[PDB]
Design a protein around this ligand. Structure first.
Ligand code: TTP
Ligand code: TTP
Ligand code: GDP
Ligand code: GDP
Ligand code: MG
Ligand code: MG
Lengths: 729, 735
């Protein structure tokens, strides 16, 4: 009756700790509602759900929940890759009768022609390694559906992504498949969505400089954003060269309306071209430089307060901050706002040069409004304490140390503030992204395995590089920028989890060492790989003239001298001889949902909480941090009463009477870590990061004193991105 | 004790001021020539200067208008000879200065006049200067002149540098270039006031990249964001260049429709207009006043019609409104029939039911009902439910405008091009548009009041004679004009359409002793539009005989020996031959695909002091700039009859501008100055129709209903439609 259920579940606890998992208990909760017309697929789904709500009891419950769902996904699915591929291709849309392939014919053909080999390279076992909430995330958006029914197993998608990247190179494809399915690294969603399909828009981010300062020019740029948006790209726009409000319009005879009305047009564009349908408007980051006359209004665009004609709330906002400005704040001083029309080219030059031009324009009469630099400064942080944005990036720091600095002045960053690339009136910059699951490399022996991490890294460089060519650009200028400079963005995830599996607290000296080494190898490995490609395919079109082409690597620009781990001199001897294929390589991105799939914490970030909520459909589930939960149960200290204590503390282990110290250090949240140490650790690794890194500052005691030193700390440390989002109480 | 305009300081003499006013009552109604009433007020307050005492002088004169409207042409004389006193005599010298302009900004040499256009003038200083009659400056009223000076006379910082005549001549040569014979000829009529070109021409003729046209009508390129944003660019560009637009938006697929290539669903008409609405607000020509004007045209079968009508309500969720825009329905006969016979009406998505907007009439019906048979219909409502929504919208915003797709298309000489998908911002222009043609139009309006005889009759012969110069002018503009988009140019050089309108029509009736709606007025209306047609065709033929026909002429209703009245099945009166005309078009043909189109004359009628366009006087008491004005003819008639006692204005205001009950005013004058609210709107409809048998485009036709409701509104629309008008309604004015 009820056994028929239990031992069906039991058949799937096939390695989980059974002193904490009790399948008899999932049965209890399932029993509620006896065969009142409940199908086996229905019942199976009820079980994994029940099982998942019991994660708070032990993490293995989540493994189980996952197994049950996967088990079903398999009983509802074709066991043969080549077969699914064909069906995906043969899809007829019932609504209009049109044959509408779901994979690319050419991908199918590379597959059919290699049926046996590929088909049998799959281990459908690997599907069972996803944890329940990762699986649900995949199932929701990542596995192609036919008629609302999921057609692909996860291994299928993974194999589609590989033979979509590597086309005829089966060996290469089969390599990538194993790396992907064994969870060593993953490509970014755009690639997981489109590799092997028709519009293979495989790129995650786009930068573009506003064209000219005209109505013709503005609208052209807009048209570009709409198209890029329709390709569900995320953009950054440099807006600083547009006339300010009041400025003269010579042709008509009147007065420029300023940045707000124009920005309000972009806003409603982001709402309109939102993939077609629902929430998450298009998503643009507008980048101002704080010398621009309109800066003060630009800062109130996201405020939750009326005069609707003066808000632009679906946009995102960032400061392209020059050094001069930071000085004039810290050493209390006047700051003079010009109109980029009275005062040309302020944006097209940086640092030593920049400061010359500004001070020139200034003591020359050509200011339009002089204010105390501190009055602006506080206006900034008044919106950040309010809205979390604008993001803080240091224009001069980005230009000072970008291997792309020979192309001209880098005019901004992207949506997520880790990409620092050049844009012109005829190049929109692009980036292809993947991430390393750093947790994967801590040895069965509590050491780290840098050889394998370098080794894997080398593969990722190859793939991302193929993508550049394979990829479909939304606008010709994107295709241009990309073939010209061939930049890529290698990134990480689970860096938190690495430490935890090493027993290293986050802010510990040992963790500060690994953080160095970990990003040291990745960069050593990517270069070695790019350098290899350069031997094979030639160095990129704009190579000679750049920093590395003049013998200077990233850390050189930071004056960082790296650890014994790798022999730079030898790698440098290679790059000297062949060059490198890729203009830039490393750009740790939020891993917003890729990490959510694999099971790790996002990016370079520590644990926000030790309990957190995931909701699935109508289901809502409290997830305790896995590492912690093993440590606690696997030590007898865990019970339910305690769960609620921790939950009574937003998620802090800290006050809990009977929890050991080595564990408290280990599992302290971010609201508990020295943010100064956070920025110091980003700075230290940033030396081996040729792009920026999406860096969030978590203050909880949300006062202006504590924040004003944060930014300046960030700045002086020499960071390109000082702040992504300000997350607070 | 007041410092004169020379530095040298004369005493304030209460006889000096008054006889200096006499000099300018050189043409005035004797019994109300009282400059002793004037200096009494001028010398009441004294706080030095001539120019400073001339302006108070000239304002206090304007304020004695509601005693007699000659005080208002005098009020203008003492502001215009004020202006005269320090604005250069000779014209060549003035056009000279404009070119030499070196502002102080980019302190850069910034020619306020065309390269060539003085090379022409000073190639002639003599002939053009000895053509100007600066006494014509004294023929304006105060408020004409103040709007003339406000923005039509070229300012050289603060000080306006042009005299009225000066700006007129500028235009005359900015149009005709080398042909001085026929540039003086134009200048004559223009300063004599027998017509005017529209503002853009008045503004830019003879300047350096001449924005010479006001109308643009385009249709939304394709149904893709690629094309949606191409159009938006176009509109921004046109907007920048002053241009008013109508856009045909019916081909964009409905809310909910499938996006194949993203596998999502269109957010629909609304989210997209919002981008347009904000564009209108952004590109408002630079800074202030009013958002670029875009009228948006939907056909009522489109799935998003009910939202469309909500866009203008100034009450509703923000991301669901679009108040800065303008809304017009492009209505097919089917829809009206379905309403009147109370049947269902099917809403479809242009992506599922393509090319509905591509065809009209007996053909559209086939395709549409075919779509019904195949059950490709997204929603079906009772046509009357849709109707009701329409006139809620009008009941509370005066829009949408009502044009009739099939009347437009069936009666257009542009037929042979395809289906006209929309009209212009003011609903007078009915022109073809396609993926790479945007229709333009160049306007001038004839001052109808000016063709009445001394002994009270109509001079149809000169009406005709003037009209001809006008078309040769408007046509010479097509070639001389500067277009903001390639497609605009292409369209115009292909089909070469021309928009000739009118003003001062109510005035024409009054001057002829006619109550607006009388049999006499009803005929004269028929007959003055009969002539304006014959006239402009006689010239368009003449032009084709000289320059050849226009590119797409052959195959058009005219090339098949069919003129507008023929397309309306109406017989012209005995007045003109027609038999003889059709014969010379049979051989030579015509240079202009379209000729006539009574646009409103918002600004240019205020200038020449005529009542707007083709309508009645709306009140007998109104307000310019504040300063008051009782209708010119009523006062004249009242005062010269003795009926106008001081008191009696307070009576006519009390009952909101009506003379229908003041027991003093005889039954005949009561007839003659009936205001619009007192005139049968169905008669103003029957008339527009009677008249528009001679207008090859449409005519912007406001409808006035004091206290509206579903009854009256449906009644008048259906009537307007039955009589076969292309524009059924412009604005609904209530109140
Ligand atoms: C036409 C127009 C321009 N602008 C602003 C947007 C741009 O930042 C700025 C440039 O407009 P432009 O279109 O470049 O104006 P222009 O053709 O007269 O060229 P210029 O004055 O440079 O000689 O003016 C408005 O804000 N509203 C408008 O209506
Ligand atoms: C991409 C996109 C399209 N649309 C609407 C606007 C137009 O009505 C229509 C044009 O979409 P298209 O730009 O033509 O998108 P598509 O390339 O996928 O073309 P299709 O679906 O026709 O194969 O869809 C949106 O409303 N929002 C969007 O984000
Ligand atoms: N259009 C759009 N793009 C986004 C959004 N969020 C992130 N991106 C892009 O994704 C990049 C970073 O990858 P990430 O956010 O970690 O996503 P993931 O790796 O695919 O889960 C950014 O640089 C953006 O260009 C969004 O909400 N909308
Ligand atoms: N840009 C713009 N164009 C207009 C506006 N009103 C009218 N127009 C254009 O001018 C035509 C009507 O003429 P009218 O308003 O009387 O012009 P005017 O009397 O010469 O100033 C229309 O067909 C429009 O194309 C406006 O408010 N803005
Ligand atoms: Mg410009
Ligand atoms: Mg399309």
């Amino acid at each position: 009756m009820f056994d028929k259920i239990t031992s069906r579940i039991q058949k799937l606890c096939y390695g989980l700790n059974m002193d904490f998992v009790d399948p008899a208990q999932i049965t209890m909760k399932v029993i509620q509602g006896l065969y009142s017309g409940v199908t086996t697929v229905e019942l199976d789904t009820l079980a994994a759900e029940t099982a998942a709500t019991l994660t708070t009891k032990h993490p293995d419950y989540a493994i189980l929940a996952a197994r049950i769902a996967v088990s079903n996904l398999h009983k509802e699915t074709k066991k043969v890759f080549s077969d699914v591929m064909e069906d995906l291709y043969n899809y007829i849309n019932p609504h209009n009768g049109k044959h509408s392939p779901m994979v690319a014919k050419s991908t199918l053909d590379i597959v059919l022609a290699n049926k046996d080999r590929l088909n049998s390279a799959i281990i459908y076992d690997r599907d069972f390694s996803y944890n329940y909430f990762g699986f649900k995330t995949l199932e929701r958006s990542y596995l192609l559906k036919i008629n609302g029914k999921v057609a692909e197993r996860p291994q299928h998608m993974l194999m589609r992504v590989s033979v979509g990247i590597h086309k005829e190179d089966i060996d290469a494809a089969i390599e990538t498949y194993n790396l992907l399915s064994e969870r060593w690294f993953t490509h970014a969603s755009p690639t997981l969505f489109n590799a092997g399909t028709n519009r293979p828009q495989l790129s995650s981010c786009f930068l573009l400089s506003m064209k000219d300062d005209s109505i013709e020019g503005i609208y052209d740029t807009l048209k570009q954003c709409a198209l890029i948006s329709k390709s569900a790209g995320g953009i950054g726009v440099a807006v600083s060269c547009i006339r300010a409000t009041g400025s003269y319009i010579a042709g008509t005879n009147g007065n420029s309306n300023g940045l707000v009305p124009m920005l309000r047009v972009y806003n409603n564009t982001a709402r309109y071209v939102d993939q077609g349908g629902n929430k998450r408007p298009g998503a643009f980051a507008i980048y101002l430089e704080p010398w621009h006359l309109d800066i003060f209004e630009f800062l109130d665009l996201k405020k939750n307060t009326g005069k609707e004609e003066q808000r632009a709330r679906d946009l995102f906002f960032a400061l392209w901050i020059p050094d001069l400005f930071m000085k004039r704040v810290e050493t209390n001083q006047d700051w003079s706002l010009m109109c980029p029309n009275e005062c040309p080219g302020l944006d097209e030059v940086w640092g030593e040069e920049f400061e010359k031009l500004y001070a020139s324009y200034e003591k020359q009469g050509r200011v339009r409004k002089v204010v105390k630099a501190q009055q602006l400064w506080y206006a900034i942080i008044e919106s950040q304490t309010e809205t979390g944005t604008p993001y803080m990036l240091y224009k001069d720091s980005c230009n000072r140390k970008s291997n792309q600095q020979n192309l001209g002045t880098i005019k901004c960053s992207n949506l997520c503030t880790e990409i620092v690339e050049y844009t012109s009136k005829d190049e929109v910059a692009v980036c292809n992204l993947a991430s390393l699951a750093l947790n994967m490399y801590v040895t069965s022996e509590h050491t780290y395995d840098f050889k394998k991490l370098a080794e894997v890294t080398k593969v990722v460089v190859r793939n991302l590089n193929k993508i550049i060519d394979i990829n479909y650009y939304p606008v010709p200028e994107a295709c241009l920028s990309n073939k010209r400079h061939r930049p890529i963005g290698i990134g990480v995830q689970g860096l938190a989890d690495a430490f935890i599996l090493m027993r290293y607290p986050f802010e510990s000296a040992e963790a500060q060492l690994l953080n160095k080494q970990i990003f040291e190898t990745i960069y050593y490995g990517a270069l070695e790989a790019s350098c290899d490609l350069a031997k094979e395919q030639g160095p990129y079109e704009t190579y000679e003239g750049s920093p590395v082409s003049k013998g200077i690597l990233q850390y050189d620009m930071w004056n960082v001298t790296p650890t014994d781990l790798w022999d730079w001199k030898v790698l440098k001897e290679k790059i000297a001889k062949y060059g490198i294929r890729n203009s830039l390589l490393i750009a740790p991105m939020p891993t917003a949902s890729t990490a959510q799939i694999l099971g790790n914490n996002e990016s370079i970030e520590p644990y926000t909480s030790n309990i957190y909520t995931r909701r699935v459909l109508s289901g809502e589930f409290q997830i305790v941090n896995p590492h912690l939960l093993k440590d606690l149960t696997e030590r007898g200290l865990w019970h339910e009463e305690m769960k609620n204590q921790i939950i009574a503390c937003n998620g802090s282990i800290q006050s809990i009477p009977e929890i050991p110290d080595d564990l408290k250090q280990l599992y302290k949240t971010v609201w508990e870590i020295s943010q100064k140490t956070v920025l110091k650790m980003a700075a230290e690794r940033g030396a081996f990061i040729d792009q920026s890194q999406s860096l969030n500052i978590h203050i909880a005691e949300p006062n202006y004193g504590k924040l004003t030193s944060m930014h300046f700390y960030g700045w002086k440390q020499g960071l390109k991105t000082g702040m992504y989002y300000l997350r607070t109480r």
